[PDB]
């Protein structure tokens, strides 16, 4: 599924991401835009052989099991394919574990480079929330 901006904001709000660990909703919307262009089916392979999955590009080295990333952990205890669903619940739930891991939203390289320090409230402007 390719979300609209406000549709995703709403879904994220409903699933408790607004101000989760102090990160306002615009931060999560901005991260999703630049990580996946709001497409739940996005995948990208990394040099190390791991793959990033779904709207928040969650990596198979640590977070989910794809069956082809040797010695990886599966800290979210889910097949990576679950992260490609039109239902963002699994992605949101795993994201909450990641953002709690010590480095906050710096775990998302697109967030760090393209959202951090910018006016992220812009991402939710206009929306009915």
Q: Which residues are annotated as a binding site for substrate?
A: 101
- Token code pair at residue 21: 């660990």
Binding of Na ion at residue 74 (CB under 5 A)? Answer: yes
- Minimal distance, residue 129 CB to Na ion, in Å: 34
CA distance 31 to 110: 6
CA distance 45 to 27: 24
- Token code pair at residue 100: 């709690």
Q: Is residue 7 flagged as an active site residue?
A: no
- Minimal distance, residue 58 CB to Na ion, in Å: 10
Q: Catalytic amino acids?
A: 35, 52
Positions that interact with Na ion (CB under 5 A) = 60, 65, 69, 72, 74
């Amino acid at each position: 599924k390719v979300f609209g901006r406000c549709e995703l904001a709403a879904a994220m709000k409903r699933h408790g991401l607004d101000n989760y660990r102090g990160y306002s909703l615009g931060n999560w919307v901005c991260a999703a835009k630049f990580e996946s262009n709001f497409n739940t089916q996005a995948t990208n392979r990394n040099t190390d052989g791991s793959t990033d999955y779904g709207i928040l590009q969650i990596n198979s080295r640590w977070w989910c099991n794809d069956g082809r990333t040797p010695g990886s952990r599966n800290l979210c205890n889910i097949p990576c394919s679950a992260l490609l669903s039109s239902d963002i619940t699994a992605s949101v739930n795993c994201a909450k574990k990641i953002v709690s891991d010590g480095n906050g939203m710096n775990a998302w390289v697109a967030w760090r480079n393209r959202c951090k320090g910018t006016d992220v409230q812009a991402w939710i402007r206009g929306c009915r929330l």
